[PDB]
């Protein structure tokens with residue numbers, strides 16, 4: 142067993158491992174775990190040693206996307222989309238984000254008790270991402286189900302359990318792919334002000350990319366639009382409700398909201414760990430990793446490392462410095478980080494401004510997402526207390 146509460150609070154385990162053997166082979170899971178900050182940093186910076194190429198027996202469109210390719214192909218692909226996602230590119234989206242936020246809040250103005258997740262932190266980012274891709278938000282419910290399947294972790298360690306899930310992932314990949322091949326066809330005919338059109342335009346003009354590659358990137362963004370920022374927002378609310386002294390201070394000092402969001406990214410990171418494959422034999426903190434072995438750098442553990450974060454187990458909305466790796470580190474550093482920060486800020490500032498006396502509803506229950514790829518809650522019932 143591990144109860145819900147232990148699953149959502151892995152930090153005692155991380156600490157134990159950090160202070161004994163921060164690099165260690167786990168026989169059961171067949172991976173090298175990496176728990177200390179310097180190890181996580183080294184694994185993620187050393188792109189030519191710790192590969193992001195995840196080989197399966199048929200590769201997917203997702204397997205050709207940015208997150209799963211090594212240099213020199215990675216730099217070429219990322220080059221085609223970088224300009225579209227800079228901080229300054231994304232400041233253009235602020236007034237859109239603020240309107241979606243207000244529209245969502247208006248829709249539940251009549252409820253005294255609301256689910257932060259279902260009504261606010263989940264819809265806002267998929268509505269943004271559907272506008273960015275140029276796909277219809279009327280398909281939101283398919284998007285969510287496909288995306289939850291893809292990031293889903295198994296309920297047990299049994300094999301008829303894992304193999305059923307693998308199957309359900311392959312089926313979701315297929316349907317996602319065929320969805321986006323249709324979209325592509327539609328856009329070749331009727332382009333729009335979206336990034337699928339923009340990549341088709343770059344393709345017609347002779348940039349080196351396949352239609353499968355456009356599908357793969359579109360899927361990556363879709364899943365990102367369903368499965369990351371939602372948890373940053375919800376987890377922030379969770380942290381502020383857990384520690385009311387932080388919440389009371391934030392309300393007095395609004396300018397601390399960005400710093401507080403960075404301290405959620407550290408303290409309750411939406412992504413706890415990543416995966417790499419050893420390309421060639423390497424020693425990492427005195428351990429000898431072999432070609433072809435898998436490695437799991439735990440950013441969630443690194444973020445609690447005392448050598449880099451004074452009083453690590455303490456949530457400090459004003460924490461400085463805060464050099465966390467919640468978006469990764471190195472060439473695969475999250476493309477969406479500017480968007481995620483601005484979505485989170487705008488939504489959280491408005492929530493806090495409207496409901497300063499908010500607290501857990503009598504119906505609240507801790508329900509962690511069953512996933513190793515994402516870290517968050519499935520629901521978060523709050524009472525407004527107006």
Ligand code: HEM
Pocket residue numbers: 193207208209219361362365366369370373410411412415416466467468469470472473474475476477478480481
């Ligand atoms: C708080 C929200 C988010 C968190 C915590 C997060 C986390 C991450 C992390 C840790 C990586 C590194 C992957 C690796 O090294 O293997 C990553 C990559 C990536 N993320 Fe995010 N993400 C978030 C939101 C977003 C959003 C909204 C987008 C949508 C544009 C996005 C798009 C991407 C892409 C396209 C990559 C691959 C970049 C590359 O390989 O060059 N992320 N993200």
Ligand SMILES: C[C@]12C[C@H](O)[C@H]3[C@@H](CCC4=CC(=O)CC[C@@]43C)[C@@H]1CC[C@@H]2C(=O)CO
Pocket residue numbers: 195203291292361364365368369412475477514515
């Ligand atoms: C889950 C995967 C890794 C990781 O989880 C991805 C996810 C797609 C959505 C996404 C957007 C981000 O900004 C952070 C990581 C992440 C949330 C990917 C879908 C297939 C991939 C794998 O399954 C590799 O095994």
